[PDB]
Write an enzyme that holds these catalytic residues in place. Sequence first.
Site, PDB file in Angstrom:
ATOM      1  CB  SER A  68      -0.910  -0.010   1.162  1.00 44.00           C
ATOM      2  OG  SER A  68      -1.996   0.657   1.203  1.00 44.00           O
TER       3      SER A  68
ATOM      4  CG  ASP B 231      -6.910  -2.561  -3.411  1.00 44.16           C
ATOM      5  OD1 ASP B 231      -7.487  -1.615  -2.962  1.00 44.16           O
ATOM      6  OD2 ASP B 231      -5.554  -3.017  -3.381  1.00 44.16           O
TER       7      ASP B 231
ATOM      8  CG  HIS C 255      -5.616  -2.242   0.212  1.00 46.88           C
ATOM      9  ND1 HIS C 255      -4.768  -2.081  -1.006  1.00 46.88           N
ATOM     10  CD2 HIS C 255      -4.941  -1.508   0.984  1.00 46.88           C
ATOM     11  CE1 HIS C 255      -3.922  -1.121  -0.634  1.00 46.88           C
ATOM     12  NE2 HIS C 255      -3.987  -0.664   0.552  1.00 46.88           N
TER      13      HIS C 255
END
EC number: 3.1.1.101
Length: 262
Positions: A132, A178, A209
């Site tokens: 991320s 995601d 995610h």
Amino acid sequence: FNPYARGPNPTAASLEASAGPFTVRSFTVSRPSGYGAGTVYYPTNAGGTVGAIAIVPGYTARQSSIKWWGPRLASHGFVVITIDTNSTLDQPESRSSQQMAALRQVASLNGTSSSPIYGKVDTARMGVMGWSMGGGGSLISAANNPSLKAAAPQAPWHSSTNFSSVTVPTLIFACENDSIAPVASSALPIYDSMSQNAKQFLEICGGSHSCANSGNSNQALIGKKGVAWMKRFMDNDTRYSTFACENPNSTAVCDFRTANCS
Ligand SMILES: *[C@@H]1O[C@H](CO)[C@@H](O)[C@H](O)[C@H]1NC(C)=O
Ligand SMILES: *[C@@H]1O[C@H](CO)[C@@H](O)[C@H](O)[C@H]1NC(C)=O
Ligand SMILES: *[C@@H]1O[C@H](CO)[C@@H](O)[C@H](O)[C@H]1NC(C)=O
Ligand SMILES: *[C@@H]1O[C@H](CO)[C@@H](O)[C@H](O)[C@H]1NC(C)=O
């Protein structure tokens, strides 16, 4: 002959296994230098110096989210540091600085006679991973430090998708479903921006995610690809060229792209 080649000739089965050929031990960094905290994973029996990889979590997240990579990679012949950031709310630029501070400290411990990794590291061969914002930070690290031998971020996010400056071999893991950093506006545009490098895009079917985090149900495929990429590019190990470059032919793969891969 390749002075950086370590371990037995790879197979699909040996790379999909939970553990590589080397025994792994770990320690907590005693005085983290320029980041929050860290765990170093290292092989006890690699039979030569190995490269180092620094792995950064996402926003709000800690080492637990990326910890599975430590043993998985180290067991194939890497020193791996998983970090906590100074703040869980650090942004990608800060995460990049901290990732590189972690690589710096691993290089320092190579030279520290009390450290379990004394003389185990080739400091000239380093890699960056992360989740991320830690994936965005890995791409920033690569853009700023083109001597890095490989990058393999997962579900990356950055306020800019333009990584056209990156010349480091870069594998992007992406997660189909995601909704934090949607593939169509984050991972895929980031991938498409990179024009100068060996690169690969691997999107995991049905993934949220967190699809490449500790506790994911695709450790066979994701671990095979991450190890193959790091072996190929950090060790210049063309035994891994097919595993690094191939479209893997897995039910788990819902998007695949690769360029300039050999
Ligand atoms: C992280 O915190 C340490 C203080 O422990 C500091 O040396 C370092 O600059 C910080 N890094 C960033 C990017 O803020
Ligand atoms: C790490 O230290 C060892 C021996 O103590 C040395 O052989 C090796 O070259 C060092 N790594 C780097 C990149 O200098
Ligand atoms: C990224 O930045 C470069 C440098 O400004 C620019 O030439 C290029 O068009 C941008 N790339 C994309 C994909 O927008
Ligand atoms: C891809 O994998 C499936 C699952 O085992 C297999 O049935 C199929 O024959 C494979 N594709 C190729 C290239 O053989």
